[PDB]
Design a protein around this ligand. Structure first.
Ligand SMILES: CCCC(=O)Nc1cccnc1Cl
Ligand SMILES: CCCC(=O)Nc1cccnc1Cl
Lengths: 264, 265
């Protein structure tokens, strides 16, 4: 992994591992999401963060994901090398974008792209805050100033509003609980676990006869180590689904999302 | 990674990733067990298996894990490079052993060791059989002929008999279910998921104040993708030892038993 020539993006190569692949012997979307998260962490490290800056660490501020958007054209095979490039960009005072492009190291062909929206909130109160000008100056020097979008197109899937699934759901997987392996180093549920939980309510028949092309996920509230999630899915159509994760008991929303699947 | 000079072992280097680490910012024992499985697979591929030989594929036979044994002296940190060497050895008609040594790439010091016992099974019927000569000969040419043991010691903990936990358990975690991420490419539950499930019944207190030194797991039955598992733990002991049982949440059919040993941080 390294910063590129101009110091405004970061690249890393990954060999797909035996346990990272599903039934077609290609990388799961959960493997793809872990590697986007790993290269994001390697980019923050390379520029002095650890993703808090100077003013942020003082007043107990953190970056948190509001939304993840991933489009995969081809899933890398077991043994294949994927190259991931990542960069960040200010969205004014509303927050921050991290973008990714995935390439076949062998062909140099683009095999996927992802984008994400981050907002600042207080670690303790979990209250959102429109970013301060003193915080931007610190992190703007690691970002391209001209716009660089993994998803440039005006009216594109990555920015569409997602509605709330209405009961009854067509499909459901209930009583989902995280184990220690699902937690990060600060004992919060890792963002990638929610992607698995969303996909858990897709019927095995869809997964067997289709490949996932697009996943958009809104993050509304964290699932704690001792919470229990219900995963709900209704067909909206290629196959398209509407998704909802909510706490098993009171039915408090934690995530909503959509997926688009192509017949193999 | 690559086969060594003599072609009787395999070495691979792994950089520890952000999401592979726990509260201590060092690799979890599940991350370690995944890397052991990855380097085992890279060793099989290197010598032309797929971990079946020619005869095995004809007779619908497979290697399956009967027992896993991991001892960790030091968990590598986020960003550390760890080097793993692995080899196999015949235990005659009984089955085969795969051993591992983990090293700090920087110091070259031994940070861990592991050993596993594999037996030959019919894929379909699940009925064990002793290793035949025709099969023995095919894989014998990829194995050191003189003994090479990760755990040479005389009365060593990798070989101890493991008893059945008696109800009531001191601790339990109920209604454990695998999701798709827990499954391998043939849609069987990954052996490493059982390790996580065993550890789920250890109180957070022990994990916060101790480090896992040793884990021994017997594999008795597979958890199907529509099974539900109960994890049971009783303290058997500055070192804490536990006895472990995984069973199907309904009829209480045993899937696994094990022991762990923890030392205070
Ligand atoms: C939360 C998204 C921002 C982030 O991960 N921080 C970062 C790291 C490296 C360079 N530039 C930036 Cl903005
Ligand atoms: C589970 C049996 C051990 C195994 O994976 N087989 C193997 C692979 C490479 C070299 N030699 C051998 Cl015996």
């Amino acid at each position: 992994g390294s910063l590129t020539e101009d110091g405004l993006s970061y690249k890393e190569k990954f060999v797909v591992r035996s346990y990272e692949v599903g039934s077609n012997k290609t990388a799961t979307v959960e493997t793809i999401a872990n590697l986007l998260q790993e290269v994001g962490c390697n980019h923050a490290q390379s520029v002095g963060f650890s993703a808090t800056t100077t003013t942020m660490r003082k007043l107990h501020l953190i970056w948190v994901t509001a939304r993840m958007h991933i489009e995969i054209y081809k899933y890398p095979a077991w043994g294949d090398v994927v190259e991931i490039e990542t960069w960040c960009q200010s969205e004014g005072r509303i927050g921050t974008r991290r973008d990714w492009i995935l390439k076949d190291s062998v062909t140099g062909e683009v095999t996927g792209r992802a984008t994400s929206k981050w907002v600042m909130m207080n670690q303790d109160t979990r209250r959102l805050q429109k970013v301060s000008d003193d915080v931007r100056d610190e992190y703007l020097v690691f970002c391209p100033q001209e716009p660089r979008l993994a998803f440039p197109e005006e009216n594109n899937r990555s920015l569409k509003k997602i509605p709330k699934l209405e009961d009854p759901a067509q499909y459901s997987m209930i009583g989902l609980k995280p184990r220690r392996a699902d937690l990060d180093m600060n004992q919060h549920v890792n963002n990638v676990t929610y992607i698995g939980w969303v996909l858990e309510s897709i019927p095995q028949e869809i997964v067997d006869t289709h490949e996932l092309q697009v996943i958009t996920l809104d993050y509304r509230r964290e699932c704690q180590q001792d919470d229990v999630v219900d995963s709900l899915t209704t067909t909206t159509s290629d196959s398209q689904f509407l998704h909802l994760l909510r706490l098993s008991g009171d039915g408090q929303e934690i995530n909503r999302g959509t997926t688009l699947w192509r017949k193999k």
